[PDB]
Design a binder for this molecule. Structure first.
Ligand SMILES: CCCCCCCCCCCCCC(=O)OC[C@H](COP(=O)(O)OCC[N+](C)(C)C)OC(=O)CCCCCCCCCCCCC
Ligand SMILES: CCCCCCCCCCCCCC(=O)OC[C@H](COP(=O)(O)OCC[N+](C)(C)C)OC(=O)CCCCCCCCCCCCC
Ligand SMILES: CCCCCCCCCCCCCC(=O)OC[C@H](COP(=O)(O)OCC[N+](C)(C)C)OC(=O)CCCCCCCCCCCCC
Ligand SMILES: CCCCCCCCCCCCCC(=O)OC[C@H](COP(=O)(O)OCC[N+](C)(C)C)OC(=O)CCCCCCCCCCCCC
Ligand SMILES: CCCCCCCCCCCCCC(=O)OC[C@H](COP(=O)(O)OCC[N+](C)(C)C)OC(=O)CCCCCCCCCCCCC
Ligand SMILES: CCCCCCCCCCCCCC(=O)OC[C@H](COP(=O)(O)OCC[N+](C)(C)C)OC(=O)CCCCCCCCCCCCC
Ligand SMILES: CCCCCCCCCCCCCC(=O)OC[C@H](COP(=O)(O)OCC[N+](C)(C)C)OC(=O)CCCCCCCCCCCCC
Ligand SMILES: CCCCCCCCCCCCCC(=O)OC[C@H](COP(=O)(O)OCC[N+](C)(C)C)OC(=O)CCCCCCCCCCCCC
Ligand SMILES: CCCCCCCCCCCCCC(=O)OC[C@H](COP(=O)(O)OCC[N+](C)(C)C)OC(=O)CCCCCCCCCCCCC
Ligand SMILES: CCCCCCCCCCCCCC(=O)OC[C@H](COP(=O)(O)OCC[N+](C)(C)C)OC(=O)CCCCCCCCCCCCC
Ligand SMILES: CCCCCCCCCCCCCC(=O)OC[C@H](COP(=O)(O)OCC[N+](C)(C)C)OC(=O)CCCCCCCCCCCCC
Ligand SMILES: CCCCCCCCCCCCCC(=O)OC[C@H](COP(=O)(O)OCC[N+](C)(C)C)OC(=O)CCCCCCCCCCCCC
Ligand SMILES: CCCCCCCCCCCCCC(=O)OC[C@H](COP(=O)(O)OCC[N+](C)(C)C)OC(=O)CCCCCCCCCCCCC
Ligand SMILES: CC(C)CCC[C@H](C)[C@H]1CC[C@H]2[C@@H]3CC=C4C[C@@H](OS(=O)(=O)O)CC[C@]4(C)[C@H]3CC[C@]12C
Ligand SMILES: [Ca+2]
Ligand SMILES: [Ca+2]
Ligand SMILES: [Zn+2]
Ligand SMILES: [Zn+2]
Length: 248
């Protein structure tokens, strides 16, 4: 429903358990209807929303669309938490692709996305064609041993882990999903590469509709496609002092 929040049934109250369950890789708090009722104010913060304890934005509608695969906040066993790389130079290589598109597209799409971010951080991404790279972008089905399937085409569309020496900074995208650049038959990879690989920098969802990673996005695609003041500010929080500077 255009307003889903008060047409919210059984279905949507499970998609919330679903959606949160899939990021944490199980969370003990997200199971149980009462405990979940509290957790739902936390999930709002992962949609960027400054109101926590109200549904009013598209949030419960939009969540049923394939729009986040990578966790927005990172909880991962076996490691100390830190969304940062340790070097001044990082590397990239597309190690498997969606075979609906030819490799030459999927290769270079990520090269745009990492260069968009690239400019404003103390970090350089160089491309390598010898072996493994720092960031491995791969395409897979959800049968390959990790927690929970990607579905097929539709609901949920990737997984990725925060920057670590080997295992981290890397992504697996859904290959049964349909992706695109300009040809429109898919989800646009130019945004989805940028949003995936930006959680690697530590970033969140915005509440400003001008910002690259606004989830409740409506009709009007960015034609040049650029970072805004809020998106530049999202990097300044990482390599400066932390401050929220959104206002009303
Ligand atoms: C030019 C006149 C002088 C000629 C002799 C110079 C000799 C240099 C000898 C040492 C060469 C290797 C140096 C190297 O690996 O530097 C690494 C840095 C990155 O260090 P990085 O990991 O960012 O900082 C370390 C911090 N840590 C441990 C916390 C992660 O930086 C790099 O990773 C970026 C540089 C990569 C170089 C790759 C090879 C380019 C050869 C190009 C030539 C092809 C034919 C023209
Ligand atoms: C020495 C540095 C440059 C090497 C370039 C030539 C390499 C030719 C093959 C040499 C022996 C390579 C052995 C090898 O591992 O090949 C596989 C790589 C892919 O590594 P990766 O994509 O990680 O493989 C993933 C899949 N896996 C894990 C199941 C193996 O795939 C390859 O590396 C094949 C790449 C073919 C296309 C290379 C295009 C180069 C630029 C052409 C410029 C065109 C400009 C218009
Ligand atoms: C040097 C002057 C050249 C002048 C070129 C002038 C413009 C020519 C355009 C030719 C376009 C070929 C169309 C083609 O079938 O591409 C097939 C694909 C490339 O995928 P692509 O079409 O980029 O995207 C398709 C995405 N999809 C499935 C979601 C619709 O790729 C393949 O399936 C693999 C590669 C096939 C190579 C085709 C090129 C030779 C075709 C004629 C072979 C004649 C042999 C006698
Ligand atoms: C002074 C002399 C100058 C002479 C002219 C330059 C000659 C060398 C050109 C090097 C390639 C430059 C053209 C090129 O990048 O084509 C890429 C396209 C699509 O890339 P895409 O990003 O979609 O288009 C890029 C440009 N853009 C965004 C501004 C529209 O690619 C395609 O759409 C191809 C789709 C079908 C085939 C897919 C698989 C191809 C495999 C490789 C076949 C063998 C090539 C040796
Ligand atoms: C003699 C040479 C003659 C050539 C004639 C043409 C000369 C150039 C004319 C203009 C060409 C395009 C200029 C350019 O910067 O294109 C960048 C593109 C697309 O950027 P895109 O994000 O679409 O637009 C960028 C601007 N933004 C963020 C504000 C929207 O981004 C790319 O297309 C990505 C490129 C990936 C390159 C893949 C190979 C990378 C290097 C690998 C090296 C390995 C070690 C050797
Ligand atoms: C077989 C393979 C052989 C490979 C040979 C490779 C030769 C490589 C030469 C590389 C020379 C690079 C020079 C340079 O400083 O480039 C970058 C800057 C802009 O960097 P910027 O985008 O600010 O990123 C800065 C650093 N960051 C990420 C850590 C914040 O650049 C600028 O500030 C000035 C830019 C002037 C135009 C640059 C070219 C743009 C069109 C690219 C066309 C490619 C046609 C083939
Ligand atoms: C043999 C090398 C001798 C000279 C070596 C000089 C030092 C080179 C490293 C300079 C370090 C400081 C500047 C810096 O970080 O610039 C980085 C930028 C952006 O990195 P980033 O913003 O991380 O964008 C990553 C994507 N990438 C690598 C595909 C451009 O990179 C760019 O903006 C690239 C701009 C285009 C340069 C034109 C390269 C043309 C290659 C044509 C290859 C045709 C091969 C047949
Ligand atoms: C004036 C025009 C100026 C044009 C400047 C264009 C930029 C030139 C950049 C050269 C360096 C780029 C390095 C690079 O990142 O290549 C990107 C891709 C593949 O990267 P790579 O990671 O090897 O791809 C993964 C492995 N793969 C292909 C098996 C799936 O590369 C490809 O996917 C390969 C593209 C088709 C190249 C085919 C050439 C066949 C030569 C055939 C004759 C061989 C000798 C008999
Ligand atoms: C003046 C004194 C110096 C003389 C010149 C020295 C130039 C050396 C440039 C070396 C470029 C390649 C560097 C490289 O290490 O690539 C390694 C990868 C896999 O190595 P791997 O052992 O998997 O990882 C090595 C690095 N490690 C242990 C730190 C993780 O390797 C691969 O993935 C590809 C292996 C096949 C490479 C084929 C290279 C020649 C291509 C020949 C034509 C193609 C034939 C099909
Ligand atoms: C006929 C043609 C065959 C192919 C010719 C290629 C000739 C190339 C000359 C220019 C080489 C340019 C490629 C280059 O940058 O090689 C540097 C590589 C690593 O580059 P880098 O960008 O660090 O790769 C990083 C990859 N990562 C993130 C997984 C660690 O460095 C390495 O990883 C380590 C060095 C490995 C090779 C050392 C070779 C020693 C030869 C000793 C001979 C002794 C005879 C007794
Ligand atoms: C004798 C008559 C000669 C007539 C000359 C015509 C010259 C046209 C120059 C235009 C330069 C515009 C700047 C540029 O880099 O434009 C690239 C565009 C779009 O980049 P971009 O919007 O990222 O493409 C995304 C994918 N798309 C279009 C499917 C949505 O790329 C595209 O949308 C596709 C590229 C179309 C190129 C048409 C020219 C083909 C080369 C003709 C060479 C004639 C030599 C005599
Ligand atoms: C010899 C030296 C070579 C210098 C080459 C420099 C090349 C610079 C290219 C940099 C990248 C350009 C990308 C570009 O197309 O931006 C478009 C913008 C905004 O377009 P937008 O409204 O975002 O739609 C953009 C997508 N498009 C192009 C596919 C429809 O378009 C604008 O906002 C409007 C532009 C209005 C220009 C009216 C005239 C300004 C003065 C021109 C003076 C030229 C005298 C020769
Ligand atoms: C009678 C028959 C007529 C024939 C008609 C043939 C078709 C003519 C139209 C061809 C299509 C033109 C499309 C066009 O507006 O492309 C503009 C592009 C990028 O615009 P942009 O706003 O960046 O689009 C962003 C990418 N998008 C749409 C995918 C989100 O612009 C570019 O990417 C800029 C390319 C040049 C970049 C220059 C960068 C280096 C400048 C320094 C150069 C020094 C040279 C010495
Ligand atoms: C001279 C004539 C007799 C032969 C002409 C050969 C042309 C150049 C074409 C036709 C058939 C083409 C291949 C088809 C098969 C593919 C798969 C394709 O994979 S994708 O997943 O990148 O689309 C990569 C290119 C490649 C190897 C093509 C290269 C280019 C290819 C050899
Ligand atoms: Ca899916
Ligand atoms: Ca890694
Ligand atoms: Zn997200
Ligand atoms: Zn995986």
């Amino acid at each position: 429903l255009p307003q889903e929040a008060g047409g919210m049934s059984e279905l949507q109250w499970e998609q919330a358990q679903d959606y949160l369950k899939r990021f944490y890789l199980y969370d003990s708090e997200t199971k149980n209807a009462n405990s979940l009722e509290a957790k739902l104010k936390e999930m709002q913060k992962f949609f960027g929303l400054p109101i926590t304890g109200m549904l009013n934005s598209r949030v419960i509608e939009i969540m049923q669309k394939p729009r986040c695969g990578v966790p927005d906040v990172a909880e991962y066993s076996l490691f100390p938490n830190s969304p940062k790389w340790t070097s001044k130079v990082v590397t990239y290589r597309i190690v498997s692709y969606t075979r609906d598109l030819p490799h030459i597209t999927v290769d270079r799409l990520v090269s745009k996305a990492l260069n968009m971010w690239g400019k404003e951080i103390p970090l350089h991404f160089r491309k390598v064609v010898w072996g493994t790279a720092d960031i491995m972008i791969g395409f897979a089905r959800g049968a390959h041993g990790d927690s929970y399937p990607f579905d097929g085409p539709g609901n949920t569309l990737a997984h990725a882990f925060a920057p670590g020496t080997g295992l981290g900074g890397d992504a697996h995208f859904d290959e049964d999903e349909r992706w695109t650049d300009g040809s429109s038959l898919g989800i646009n990879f130019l945004y989805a590469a940028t949003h995936a690989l930006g959680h690697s920098l530590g970033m969140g969802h915005s509440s400003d509709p001008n910002a690259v990673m606004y989830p409740t996005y409506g009709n009007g695609d960015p034609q040049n496609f650029k970072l805004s003041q809020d998106d530049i500010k999202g990097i300044q929080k990482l390599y400066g002092k932390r401050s929220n500077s959104r206002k009303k």
